Amino acid sequence: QELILSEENKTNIAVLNLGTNDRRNAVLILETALHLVEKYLGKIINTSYLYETVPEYIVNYINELMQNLEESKYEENKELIDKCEEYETFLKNGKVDNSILKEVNVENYLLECNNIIVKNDEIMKNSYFYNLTVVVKTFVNDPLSMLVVIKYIEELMKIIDIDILFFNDFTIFMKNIKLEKNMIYKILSKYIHLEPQEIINNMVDNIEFLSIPHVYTTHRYSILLCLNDMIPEYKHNVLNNTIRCLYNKYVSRMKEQYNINIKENNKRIYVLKDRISYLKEKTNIVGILNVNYDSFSDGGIFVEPKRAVQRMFEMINEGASVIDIGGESSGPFVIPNPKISERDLVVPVLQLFQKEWNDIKNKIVKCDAKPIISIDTINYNVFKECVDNDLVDILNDISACTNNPEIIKLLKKKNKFYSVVLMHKRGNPHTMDKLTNYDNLVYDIKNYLEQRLNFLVLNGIPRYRILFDIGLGFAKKHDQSIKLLQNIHVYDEYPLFIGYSRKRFIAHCMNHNWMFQMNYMRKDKDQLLYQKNICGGLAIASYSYYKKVDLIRVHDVLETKSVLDVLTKIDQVKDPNSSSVDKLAAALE
Amino acid sequence: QELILSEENKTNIAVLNLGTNDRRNAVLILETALHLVEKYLGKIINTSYLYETVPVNYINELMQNLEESKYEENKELIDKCEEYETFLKNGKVDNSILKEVNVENYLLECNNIIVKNDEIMKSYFYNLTVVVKTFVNDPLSMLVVIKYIEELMKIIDIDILFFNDFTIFMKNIKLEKNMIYKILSKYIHLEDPQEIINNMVDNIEFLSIPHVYTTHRYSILLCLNDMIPEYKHNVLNNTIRCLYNKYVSRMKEQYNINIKENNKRIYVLKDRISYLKEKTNIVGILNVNVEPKRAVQRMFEMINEGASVIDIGGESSGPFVIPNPKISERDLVVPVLQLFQKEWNDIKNKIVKCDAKPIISIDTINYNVFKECVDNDLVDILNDISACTNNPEIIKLLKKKNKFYSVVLMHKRGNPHTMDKLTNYDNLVYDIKNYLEQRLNFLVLNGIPRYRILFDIGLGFAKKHDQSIKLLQNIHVYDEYPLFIGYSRKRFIAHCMNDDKDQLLYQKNICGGLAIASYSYYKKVDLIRVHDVLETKSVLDVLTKIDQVKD
Ligand SMILES: Nc1ncnc2c1ncn2[C@@H]1O[C@H](COP(=O)(O)OP(=O)(O)OP(=O)(O)O)[C@@H](O)[C@H]1O
Ligand SMILES: Nc1ncnc2c1ncn2[C@@H]1O[C@H](COP(=O)(O)OP(=O)(O)OP(=O)(O)O)[C@@H](O)[C@H]1O
Ligand SMILES: Nc1nc(O)c2nc(CNc3ccc(C(=O)O)cc3)cnc2n1
Ligand SMILES: Nc1nc(O)c2nc(CNc3ccc(C(=O)O)cc3)cnc2n1
Ligand SMILES: [Ca+2]
Ligand SMILES: [Ca+2]
Ligand SMILES: [Mg+2]
Ligand SMILES: [Mg+2]
Ligand SMILES: [Mg+2]
């Protein structure tokens, strides 16, 4: 009552659940809440994947809302961290200050939660969910104050359900709560510069009780599923075991006891731009536009932006979902044009593309056929000018953001998040072919990428926006490139982006309507070799399709799309039991 | 003492096992034996696959100087064999001229031979069974003739597994060398023979029918299961199929050994062993419908691009195709094939590439065309898109005195103009499969080796696009059979796609076919018939490389 509003500069760890039932807008809704959490509550230092969830039993006013928000009373800083001691403390069970709110014991907690569960069960006797967890390092003093601010956040969004799953190591159950409008105003005022009055009203009745941990933490698969991504090793006093063990037990008991595969209807989601993609449900084509190549393979000396943009339109028409544009070549032994800059190679092209795209009259005819744009850069300044001018959706960083970790701050704005490809390499175009010694090739690269994701996620990059790339041909011998492909299954839990297109390791596999469009006249021998190389990669397209690789980065968009279209058709069975049924019918003659 | 040489012309049914241990020449050796069986013993009316089982050129001369049989060789096609049906049931047959033993005695004497052998014992075998409708009076006469065949071949083991419904165990067989001569002379115009008979005198110690090991060797049951799965001899507990099954299940549940792992089914394209399901072979298409010289360099191009087989045709069978009144099928294909043979032989210079010779396949349904091909040794394979139903007489051309040819049997209905309308099937996948099986049964009854017959579902031929796809989706129904498919550049590919502008459609088609090549690789299709050989080879090499695990 008293210590709730004391001016003690406190640092706490809370774990939240963010849920919505609105599919079309699931991303916008949940990311808006992420922003409001970052703004009003503290620092997001962990996230789970996004998930489409089936429950246990079985407009654009946000835009304007974001423009006119009350400033926080706390400093926002986008600075990078490589660790967070209070988080470390929370994950172990290190000594933390005693709860200012009154705690219950374990047994009393479990009885109160069970009561809520049986009570909600009963009421029910008389939709898809979209879910994400977050860990917040928070300046709010207690879960009751936090819930008040969360209730404010919900109301601001005018559809969204934000729950507190954990708050430090506290065990709390507060049975009856009637906060006067007076009290709400004072909690809010401690954290927000308040203007605005119509909101506090709805809030009064909304907080009936407080349960920490949340009543449903152990009961809802969808929560265990999300927590398992973030904090698998966490054990709270109330819990029988670690998050991971509880998660695994839930899965195997649904199998053993009810004959259900609980994974079937609880789908991991990743995000490329602003829409839901179901992990492993589609192999997307990323069409390659290398401006250097496109311009100077000629033997020419001038960039040709119009030719560049034409090519971008061609690849869209050929069925690319993403275009990857770059102006810094990174293939073996390539010296760049040292006279024209990366920025001048790509930005004009992207600017012209934006202009041509916009020169289209549509209101319901053709509005969402826009390709996602990826920029192959490691360069902060280039990426910054692109996002400032809305030229791109995705950072493709072949250094996994180690060239300049600050580029990571650019993947976040007040209202926008951007997705990012992290790739493994060693060395540069001139050195990489000799940097080939690995203790454990497959796991070294996996562990490297996971460490990078952990770093991005610590810095509040949403987990579902980070894609992995093993970097074929980049400090790998041909046999190693193959081995990475043979062992691609190790990425079955992750959004996977690969680039094999026209690389040397394909030719190493080998013992006419030409698919290589010659830039200069080639010999017959070489045309054949190019043909084999492009066809060799269509083999990897097939392999990728069957391995459920999420994105493939290719020069030959029409060819690749033709392959994926036929594999998709063969896979779409009209009736999934017809083969046994037809067989039995034939035996019965 | 001579009821054996009785002139009562009889028709019996015998089941033989042919075995060799020479892998490199297994086909030549076993097929040599088949020829000699057809010549000396009667008519082959059933064969198993060839199998590799875990337990040189004087032949060419031999085949040129054989003594004639005294019995006739009739080639007319048959559709039924009464004696065989009698044998498949345990129908009533004439009493054995050799004295029979009962089950108990047989089982006792067999067990005696096995145990005596188990302790004597304390490389791969190539095996094949055949059913022979035989003019030989009795199993002992047959063994005499068989030992002669083995001696002629100078390497080969030929056993009598069954002979009618007889149960026989004869212990201490001594045959005077004059009696062996007399038996031989009853079936063969003996014209060297006389320093061969003396070898034989040692050989026949005893005669067991069924053969001692019939029910005890997996390799035997494996072959018999192909031919006569439902057959139950008096002296056996269960039918062939049950004995086979209860040997696979025993070996799994008693040893954790998959017996199928070491025992490989074989098919033959030309003259070498192919392990079923172990390679996706490329068949390059040559449509001569094209000037001979050009056609032939195209053939050489395709070999160099990695085609195992070249399929030449001079009759288009694609939809609504306009025929050529100007030049006959014969005049299109035969000169090309003649020039190829000549051009290939002129590369006798590069003697080191004498085994790089492609298998040649002719896409025809026309007896006259095929007859000219085989007479002039221009081809190895008949690709008959009618499954040999258009003119069944062509089946007679798949055999010579010292040669067998392989055949692709394809399913279709109607003709190029009507096929698009003949699209109603009660059970598309099983109708086509059953049809191909019926065709195979007809050829096998007619003495075509089972292991030389390839199945083809006929994509695009009396199938709507979705039906073509459905066949592909359900290609696993051919897991037991050598499978040949042709998808290359067919309309159904374009139908999969989402939606020099014709060269756009053309490229999509080629690329869509490369997807089917990938699918086929993984489904272990034995042969794929394609236009774009370099492209297909590139796909297969990469997929193969990915499958190959190193250290
Ligand atoms: N940890 C918690 N987080 C959020 N609400 C909580 C918590 N503990 C108790 N509550 C209470 O539960 C209610 C939250 O209602 P909400 O609209 O989020 O959906 P619900 O399904 O009814 O509740 P819950 O959040 O318990 O699942 C409020 O009355 C709130 O006081
Ligand atoms: N049904 C039969 N077929 C072949 N040989 C038989 C048969 N019954 C008995 N035999 C005898 O077995 C001999 C076969 O010896 P072979 O050189 O084939 O080696 P094996 O495998 O030890 O013999 P078997 O074929 O009897 O198992 C014949 O010469 C004959 O004495
Ligand atoms: N995310 C991502 N993933 C790639 O795989 C990639 N590749 C290139 C091109 N770089 C190479 C590297 C190696 C080779 C060879 O060995 O042939 C060729 C080209 C550029 N951007 C890329 N971006
Ligand atoms: N064994 C065999 N197997 C084939 O599949 C095949 N196809 C053709 C060519 N025939 C067609 C049929 C249909 C289509 C279409 O729908 O486009 C095109 C060509 C010729 N010989 C063939 N021989
Ligand atoms: Ca913040
Ligand atoms: Ca005969
Ligand atoms: Mg709630
Ligand atoms: Mg191309
Ligand atoms: Mg023997």
Short mmCIF file of N, CA and C in Angstrom, two decimals, chain B residues 469-515:
data_model
loop_
_atom_site.label_atom_id
_atom_site.label_comp_id
_atom_site.label_asym_id
_atom_site.label_seq_id
_atom_site.Cartn_x
_atom_site.Cartn_y
_atom_site.Cartn_z
N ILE B 469 -0.39 -37.13 -62.49
CA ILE B 469 0.12 -36.79 -61.15
C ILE B 469 -0.18 -37.89 -60.13
N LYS B 470 -1.42 -38.38 -60.13
CA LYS B 470 -1.84 -39.40 -59.17
C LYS B 470 -1.01 -40.69 -59.31
N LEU B 471 -0.74 -41.10 -60.55
CA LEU B 471 0.14 -42.22 -60.83
C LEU B 471 1.51 -41.98 -60.20
N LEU B 472 2.09 -40.80 -60.43
CA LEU B 472 3.38 -40.45 -59.84
C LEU B 472 3.31 -40.51 -58.31
N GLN B 473 2.25 -39.93 -57.73
CA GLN B 473 2.11 -39.91 -56.29
C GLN B 473 2.10 -41.34 -55.73
N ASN B 474 1.66 -42.29 -56.55
CA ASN B 474 1.41 -43.65 -56.08
C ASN B 474 2.38 -44.62 -56.75
N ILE B 475 3.54 -44.11 -57.12
CA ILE B 475 4.56 -44.87 -57.84
C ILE B 475 5.13 -45.97 -56.93
N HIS B 476 4.95 -45.85 -55.60
CA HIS B 476 5.42 -46.86 -54.66
C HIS B 476 4.81 -48.24 -54.95
N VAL B 477 3.68 -48.30 -55.67
CA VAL B 477 3.09 -49.61 -55.97
C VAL B 477 3.99 -50.45 -56.89
N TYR B 478 5.04 -49.86 -57.49
CA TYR B 478 6.01 -50.57 -58.33
C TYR B 478 7.31 -50.90 -57.58
N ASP B 479 7.28 -50.85 -56.24
CA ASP B 479 8.46 -51.08 -55.42
C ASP B 479 9.07 -52.45 -55.71
N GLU B 480 8.27 -53.40 -56.19
CA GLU B 480 8.81 -54.73 -56.40
C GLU B 480 9.29 -54.93 -57.85
N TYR B 481 9.06 -53.97 -58.74
CA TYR B 481 9.13 -54.22 -60.18
C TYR B 481 10.15 -53.31 -60.82
N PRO B 482 10.81 -53.68 -61.94
CA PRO B 482 11.68 -52.75 -62.66
C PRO B 482 10.77 -51.73 -63.33
N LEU B 483 11.01 -50.45 -63.09
CA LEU B 483 10.06 -49.43 -63.47
C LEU B 483 10.74 -48.41 -64.40
N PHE B 484 10.04 -48.10 -65.50
CA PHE B 484 10.46 -47.21 -66.57
C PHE B 484 9.33 -46.17 -66.70
N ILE B 485 9.66 -44.88 -66.63
CA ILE B 485 8.62 -43.88 -66.82
C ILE B 485 9.15 -42.85 -67.79
N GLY B 486 8.21 -42.19 -68.50
CA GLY B 486 8.51 -41.08 -69.38
C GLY B 486 7.60 -39.88 -69.11
N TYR B 487 8.15 -38.83 -68.50
CA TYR B 487 7.39 -37.62 -68.19
C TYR B 487 7.83 -36.48 -69.10
N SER B 488 8.94 -36.67 -69.80
CA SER B 488 9.71 -35.59 -70.38
C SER B 488 8.91 -34.74 -71.37
N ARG B 489 8.78 -33.45 -71.02
CA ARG B 489 8.13 -32.40 -71.80
C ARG B 489 6.64 -32.66 -72.01
N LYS B 490 5.98 -33.39 -71.10
CA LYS B 490 4.58 -33.72 -71.34
C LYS B 490 3.67 -32.64 -70.75
N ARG B 491 2.47 -32.52 -71.33
CA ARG B 491 1.52 -31.49 -70.98
C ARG B 491 1.29 -31.44 -69.47
N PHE B 492 1.28 -32.59 -68.79
CA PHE B 492 0.91 -32.59 -67.38
C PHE B 492 1.88 -31.75 -66.55
N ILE B 493 3.12 -31.55 -67.02
CA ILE B 493 4.08 -30.75 -66.28
C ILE B 493 3.62 -29.29 -66.21
N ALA B 494 3.23 -28.73 -67.37
CA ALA B 494 2.77 -27.35 -67.51
C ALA B 494 1.55 -27.13 -66.63
N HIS B 495 0.76 -28.19 -66.45
CA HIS B 495 -0.44 -28.15 -65.63
C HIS B 495 -0.10 -27.97 -64.14
N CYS B 496 1.14 -28.26 -63.74
CA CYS B 496 1.51 -28.13 -62.34
C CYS B 496 1.82 -26.67 -62.02
N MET B 497 2.00 -25.86 -63.05
CA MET B 497 2.60 -24.56 -62.83
C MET B 497 1.58 -23.44 -62.65
N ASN B 498 2.00 -22.48 -61.80
CA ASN B 498 1.15 -21.63 -60.99
C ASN B 498 0.35 -20.66 -61.85
N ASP B 499 1.07 -19.89 -62.69
CA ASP B 499 0.48 -18.85 -63.52
C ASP B 499 0.26 -17.59 -62.67
N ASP B 500 10.03 -15.34 -78.23
CA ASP B 500 10.55 -16.49 -77.44
C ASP B 500 9.78 -16.58 -76.12
N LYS B 501 8.46 -16.37 -76.18
CA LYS B 501 7.59 -16.58 -75.04
C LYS B 501 7.15 -18.05 -75.00
N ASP B 502 7.42 -18.77 -76.09
CA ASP B 502 7.23 -20.21 -76.18
C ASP B 502 8.44 -20.92 -75.57
N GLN B 503 9.61 -20.26 -75.64
CA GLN B 503 10.86 -20.80 -75.10
C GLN B 503 10.88 -20.61 -73.59
N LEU B 504 9.89 -19.86 -73.09
CA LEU B 504 9.63 -19.68 -71.67
C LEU B 504 8.93 -20.93 -71.14
N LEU B 505 7.82 -21.28 -71.80
CA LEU B 505 7.04 -22.48 -71.53
C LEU B 505 7.93 -23.72 -71.65
N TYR B 506 8.83 -23.69 -72.64
CA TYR B 506 9.73 -24.79 -72.94
C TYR B 506 10.70 -24.99 -71.77
N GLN B 507 11.21 -23.89 -71.22
CA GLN B 507 12.18 -23.97 -70.14
C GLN B 507 11.50 -24.46 -68.87
N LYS B 508 10.31 -23.91 -68.57
CA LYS B 508 9.54 -24.32 -67.41
C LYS B 508 9.31 -25.83 -67.43
N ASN B 509 8.97 -26.34 -68.61
CA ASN B 509 8.73 -27.75 -68.86
C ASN B 509 10.00 -28.55 -68.58
N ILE B 510 11.13 -28.11 -69.12
CA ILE B 510 12.34 -28.85 -68.87
C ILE B 510 12.60 -28.87 -67.36
N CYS B 511 12.41 -27.71 -66.72
CA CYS B 511 12.73 -27.58 -65.30
C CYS B 511 11.74 -28.39 -64.46
N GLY B 512 10.46 -28.38 -64.84
CA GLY B 512 9.47 -29.20 -64.16
C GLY B 512 9.82 -30.68 -64.26
N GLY B 513 10.38 -31.09 -65.40
CA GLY B 513 10.81 -32.47 -65.54
C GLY B 513 11.97 -32.80 -64.59
N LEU B 514 12.85 -31.82 -64.34
CA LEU B 514 13.97 -32.03 -63.43
C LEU B 514 13.49 -32.24 -61.99
N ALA B 515 12.34 -31.66 -61.63
CA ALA B 515 11.67 -31.96 -60.37
C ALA B 515 11.22 -33.42 -60.34
#
